[PDB]
Copies of this chain bind each other. A is one copy, B any other.
Amino acid sequence: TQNVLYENQKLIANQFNSAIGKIQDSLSSTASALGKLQDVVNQNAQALNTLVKQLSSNFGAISSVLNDILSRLDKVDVDLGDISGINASVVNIQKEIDRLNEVAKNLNESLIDLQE
């Protein structure tokens, strides 16, 4: 029984350690994917905001030129739709990303080193 029991414990430690290594990689991959999603979402939010600000300035100019045209045509007050309140939010998941990376490293302390 003692040789089956000790070989069992070795098998358990080895399989556990093996599973922990695989989980560490999966946490690092997850952290990496979240970081890239966070960056692109925030980049595309900033693009949308920049777009909005430049558009409403383009509608301002168009409105001013149209108004000038209309008066000069009377010689022989058009308000375009305001978009400047449209706003894309940014995301912040850095604390969650840091936690996953911290656990991937911390799980090293959970490895089993059996006594021979």
Contacts and interface: CB of A to CB of B under 8 A. Distances in A.
A54 to B, nearest CB: 5
Nearest to A3: B1
Nearest to A38: B37
Contact residue range for chain A? 35 or more
Interface in A57-116: 57-59, 61-62, 65-66, 69-70, 72-73, 76, 78, 80-81, 83, 86-93, 95-97, 99-100, 103, 106-107, 109-112, 114-115
Number of copies: 3
A11 B70 CA distance: 86
Interface string A39-64: 11101110110111011011101100
